């Protein structure tokens, strides 16, 4: 009975889609807040601003943080929905992204968005520090981090890896608070402003400006972190923008 099969499949297909469509469209907004507060919790944590709870995070994020958009090819601010720009989606589309060459793609990121979002921290009506999203592939998965750089554009205030997939213990210590705290006070650039952040096998010399101890027995993941910064701390990453911040 062809008529019977068409009636049941068509009738079920529209109606089930209706329940699914109603659930997805209706709950999307609630999901939207949940996704936003997750990023705000990280930006505050690295900034050194303790916040806890949705009410505090939203109130404090608006008070202290001013998201902005930056064009990598020029290192200059652009106007847009900084609060909503999705660099991940942009990097996947040729309209708002470019494809990297083997030489340019040091961090193994296949593509780099034409515009990437930055966050400005303002102690008062002036920006006391800038937070830059940086990502690059390690040994096992893409690792995404936020890096809070002081007004100098060279000294780093905080680091946090908010998305990574690596073996806990050997290579997964990018989440370890002690290793992240070692970055505070470090210099992103050298005397001549070339990416200089270096991950040191065996331990950095005491007082090292750009020496962060690598993950013991985890050279491959430590190499990825170095590759992450060498792309973003350079001409095709945030290099041009930080030059403007620098002076």
């Amino acid at each position: 009975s062809i008529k019977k099969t068409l009636f049941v499949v068509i009738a079920l297909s529209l109606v089930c889609s209706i329940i699914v469509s109603a659930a997805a469209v209706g709950l999307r907004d609630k999901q939207k807040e949940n996704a936003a507060l997750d990023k705000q919790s990280k930006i505050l944590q690295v900034a050194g601003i303790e916040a806890k709870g949705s009410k505090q995070i939203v109130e404090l994020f608006n008070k202290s943080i001013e998201p902005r958009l930056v064009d990598f090819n020029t290192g200059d601010f652009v106007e847009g929905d900084a609060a909503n720009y999705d660099q991940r989606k942009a990097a996947k589309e040729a309209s708002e992204s470019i494809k990297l060459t083997a030489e340019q793609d040091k961090a193994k990121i296949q593509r780099r968005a034409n515009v990437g979002v930055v966050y400005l921290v303002k102690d008062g009506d002036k920006t006391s520090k800038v937070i830059l999203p940086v990502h690059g592939n390690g040994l096992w998965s893409m690792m995404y981090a936020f890096v809070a750089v002081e007004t100098d554009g060279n000294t780093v205030s905080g680091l946090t890896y908010y998305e990574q997939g690596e073996t806990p213990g050997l290579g997964g210590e990018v989440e370890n608070p002690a290793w992240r705290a070692q970055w505070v006070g470090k210099k992103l650039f050298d005397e001549n402003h070339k990416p200089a952040i270096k991950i040191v096998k065996g331990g950095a010399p005491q007082g090292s400006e750009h020496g962060v101890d690598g993950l013991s027995g985890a050279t491959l993941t430590s190499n990825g972190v170095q590759n992450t910064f060498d792309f973003w701390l350079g001409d095709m990453g945030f290099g041009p923008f930080l030059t403007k911040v620098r002076d």
């Binding site: 040994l139 050997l170 065996g202 027995g217 491959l220």
Partner: protein, 384 residues
């Protein structure tokens, strides 16, 4: 049981002449075949450790180190010396203090599981455990903790062999499976720069790691500060696992069992072919960035456990292919995989153990292909 009164011919057409070879004689031949690598393994284990200790400490500082490590002062008590003027006797004695506890633990613990399965299932004990115990003890770092040795043999004996019915009824190499268990369960004790030498506080990368970092030029014995020549790796005067170091010692033992017919020369031949082809192919392609592309065949041979695996573990009759054509295919995949893992796998400096295990899984398909093509030739009456 019982006794009965009259016979039948079946039982009368017995074997009336048989060959001297038996399973017992096969295992003892292999057990003796690794003795030369084992005795040297200890001398090398002591020599590397003693050399590293003198490069790291001297005077009263060395005395404190010797007093705080039972391996060192036990060597002093028995007549050896930890000073750099120690002769071959003292080096072998110190290496023994590491090997024997590992071998004793592996033999007893693995033997307990063997007898337990035999006791409960009313099987007679099998002599194959002599090879698994000795080989497992010889493919681990000298510094391996005993409790990890116990766990490793248990996985190899039980999970890989006994649950399959014991000797002759499994498909995966038992000794390498225990090493694989420790490799992934406790990688820190069987990897890095701190496990291949018994000199406390010493960090030294082995040749494969050094080559992967800076090529042939990086090959340095930190204790001595001297270049590692190809001759050193062949003889085994290089850091590493106890037993694998001497490609020469392994070849001597491998020749006897190969001549005696215990080890398949088609498998060994296949391994050499697979390595040479792939290693030479990488050499030709070249790589301005990967130092491992340029490692030649003769260097691939004398580094790591290629020789030990190729001769004494890839030749495992139960886990290898049963067809002469399959034996060639089985060996080549091991040789290709070892080079592949060595060159294009960043995480692992060696790939022999993992390679054989991959090949164990596919030896049965190769045999199947050979046999199914044979059935078709027969169904065609051999074109007669």
């Amino acid at each position: 049981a019982t006794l009965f009164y009259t016979p039948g011919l079946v039982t009368k057409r017995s074997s009336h002449v048989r060959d001297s070879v038996d399973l017992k004689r096969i295992m003892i031949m292999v057990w003796l075949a690794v003795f030369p690598a084992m005795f040297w393994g200890m001398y090398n284990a002591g020599g590397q450790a003693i050399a590293a200790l003198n490069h790291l400490y001297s005077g009263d500082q060395l005395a404190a180190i010797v007093a705080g490590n039972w391996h060192y002062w036990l060597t002093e008590m028995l007549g050896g010396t930890m000073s750099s003027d120690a002769g071959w006797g003292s080096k072998m004695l110190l290496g023994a203090t590491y090997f024997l506890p590992i071998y004793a633990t592996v033999f007893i613990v693995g033997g307990f599981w063997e007898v337990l399965f035999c006791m409960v299932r009313k099987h007679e004990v099998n002599e194959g455990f002599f090879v698994t115990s000795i080989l497992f003890a010889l493919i681990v770092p000298p510094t391996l903790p005993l409790w990890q040795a116990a766990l490793g043999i248990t996985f190899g004996v039980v999970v890989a062999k006994e649950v399959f019915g014991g000797t002759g009824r499994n498909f995966l190499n038992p000794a390498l499976a225990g090493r694989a268990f420790l490799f992934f369960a406790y990688p820190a004790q069987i990897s890095g720069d701190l496990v291949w030498t018994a000199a406390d506080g010493y960090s030294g990368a082995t040749a494969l790691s050094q080559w992967a970092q800076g090529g042939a030029g990086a090959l340095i014995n930190n204790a001595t500060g001297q270049t590692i020549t190809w001759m050193d790796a062949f003889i085994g005067n290089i850091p590493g696992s106890i037993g694998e170091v001497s490609t020469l010692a392994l070849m001597i033992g491998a020749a006897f069992i190969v001549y005696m017919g215990i080890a398949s020369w088609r498998i060994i031949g296949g391994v050499m072919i697979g390595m040479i082809l792939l290693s030479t192919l990488f050499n030709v392609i070249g790589s301005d960035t990967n130092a491992m592309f340029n490692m030649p065949w003769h260097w691939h041979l004398v580094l790591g456990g290629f020789a030990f695996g190729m001769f004494f573990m890839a030749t495992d009759p139960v886990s290898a292919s049963f067809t002469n054509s399959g034996k060639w295919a089985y060996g080549i995949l091991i040789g290709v995989m070892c080079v592949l893992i060595r060159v294009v796998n960043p995480a692992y400096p060696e790939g022999m153990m993992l390679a054989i295990l991959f090949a164990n899984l596919f030896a049965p398909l190769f045999d199947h292909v050979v046999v199914e093509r044979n059935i078709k030739r027969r169904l065609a009456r051999y074109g007669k």
